[PDB]
């Protein structure tokens, strides 16, 4: 067995040490005992590997010297904290596979090395300790964006405007339920926290508060569903989306579009959903009048997606749905022949309204639909290749005996293939 023993430790320092030690022990695959007193901590581990033993020793030393009232001990703590942070930040580099994430990681490490405050340093360490475990590089983007935002806003010369922006942004991030919104808020906040331009700060603070207004209105509309008050709130959401397009900060309009789409998807056939589709059309028209391409294409995309969901619900059939940057795909399964005819009939009935490029593929008892806009003729012909390949892969896998859960997985692997063939 291996043992550690930690004298004169203050309770807040004690409430740190075990957390980090446990995470290392759970990384190394070893059992642990811990015991606590007023002023003392004792720990024992099954046959701990020397590399982890040295890292735990480094952390224990750092904890004592971070508590110590001596300025030279606190300086040595800043050094050991930044040293451990730098090793963890380096450990993330090979694991991560997106260059913007690698940029964010290197920036976080640099911001921490510039930071005067051990508590900032420790939360940056906490973010990196989450990132190293994290399964999704997009969650790593959220984590590192939050890390960067915390560090860059917490700086020793930071204006209260920057602190207010960070507080608004992080509160919005904590309140939100869709990761895409969290990204769009945090990214704008990070760009503000990196900058010194008071116009960028002002624009971002208004934009974050306009996102907050959108988030709050969606909470009100949702929780008060089945009412004239919710029906009134739909109009107000759409009108803030229109104001966002009139101002041109159209990333928040992307938020508002998605918020309306959630409401519409969550309450099929309702008067609310009936208001939402009509709103989404005016928002698309407003986005076309303002030339905001990806946003306008997103409005078209969401409209068509609602329509196939509505067709599916009216047919009462199984479907699967996934999304991408400039296209949508919906896969229908077990569709009865008269419903194959009727779905085809309705896809045209949608298409001749919305003006989209659209492709439909029929194989076995599966139909794959793909919709795309703004892309070139050649990109559309490659998308035509992809949807045909998606139908081939799905039906040949189902012919090979792929279960429902295996086809549900396969759409993720095909969505990745569709990025890999880019």
């Amino acid at each position: 067995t291996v043992t550690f023993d930690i004298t004169n430790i203050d309770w807040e320092t004690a409430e740190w040490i075990m957390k980090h030690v446990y995470l290392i022990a759970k990384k190394e695959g070893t059992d642990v005992t811990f015991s606590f007193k007023e002023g003392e901590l004792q720990i024992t581990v099954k046959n701990l590997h020397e590399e982890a033993k040295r890292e735990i020793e480094k952390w224990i030393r750092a904890a004592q010297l971070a508590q110590d009232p001596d300025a030279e001990s606190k300086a040595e703590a800043r050094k050991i904290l930044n040293e451990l942070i730098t090793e963890k930040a380096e450990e993330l580099r090979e694991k991560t596979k997106d260059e913007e994430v690698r940029e964010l990681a290197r920036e976080a490490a640099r911001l921490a090395l510039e930071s005067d405050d051990i508590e900032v340093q420790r939360v940056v360490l906490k973010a990196l300790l989450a990132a190293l475990k994290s399964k999704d590089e997009e969650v790593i983007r959220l984590l590192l964006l939050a890390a960067v935002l915390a560090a860059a806003a917490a700086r020793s010369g930071s204006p209260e405007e920057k602190l207010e922006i960070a507080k608004k942004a992080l509160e919005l991030a904590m309140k939100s339920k869709d990761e895409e919104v969290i990204r769009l808020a945090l990214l704008a906040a990070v760009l503000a926290a990196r900058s010194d331009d008071e116009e960028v700060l002002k624009k971002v603070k208004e934009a974050l508060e306009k996102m907050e207004r959108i988030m709050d209105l969606e909470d009100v509309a949702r929780e008060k569903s089945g009412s004239a008050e919710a029906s009134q709130a739909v109009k107000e959401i759409a009108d803030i989306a229109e104001e966002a397009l009139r101002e041109g900060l159209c990333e928040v309009a992307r938020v508002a579009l998605k918020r309306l789409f959630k409401l519409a998807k969550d309450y099929p056939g309702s008067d609310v959903a009936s208001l939402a589709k009509k709103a989404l059309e005016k928002i698309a028209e407003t986005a076309l009048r303002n030339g905001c391409k990806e946003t306008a294409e997103l409005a078209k995309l969401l409209l068509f997606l609602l329509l196939i969901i509505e067709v599916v619900l009216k047919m009462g059939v199984r479907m699967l749905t996934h999304r991408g940057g400039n296209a949508v795909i919906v896969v229908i399964e077990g569709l009865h022949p008269s419903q194959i005819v009727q779905l085809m009939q309705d896809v045209i009935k949608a298409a001749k309204k919305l003006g989209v490029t659209v492709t439909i593929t029929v194989s076995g008892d599966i139909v794959v639909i793909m919709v795309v806009v703004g892309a070139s003729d050649e990109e559309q012909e490659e998308a035509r290749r992809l949807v045909q390949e998606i139908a081939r892969a799905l039906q040949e896998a189902k012919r090979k005996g792929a279960n429902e859960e295996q086809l549900e997985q396969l759409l993720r692997e095909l969505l990745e293939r569709a990025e890999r063939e880019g």
């Binding site: 405050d117 508590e119 900032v120 939360v123 906490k126 973010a127 989450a130 475990k133 994290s134 399964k135 999704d136 969650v139 959220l142 984590l143 939050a146 890390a147 935002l149 915390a150 806003a153 917490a154 930071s158 209260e160 602190l163 207010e164 960070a166 507080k167 992080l170 509160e171 991030a173 904590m174």
Partner: peptide, 26 residues
Amino acid sequence: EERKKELAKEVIETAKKLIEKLAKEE
């Protein structure tokens, strides 16, 4: 300085809580 030191602690705590929120669904 005091109001900024409190706001910084609020940011840090909010960030810890957000790191937990981002982790706990995983």
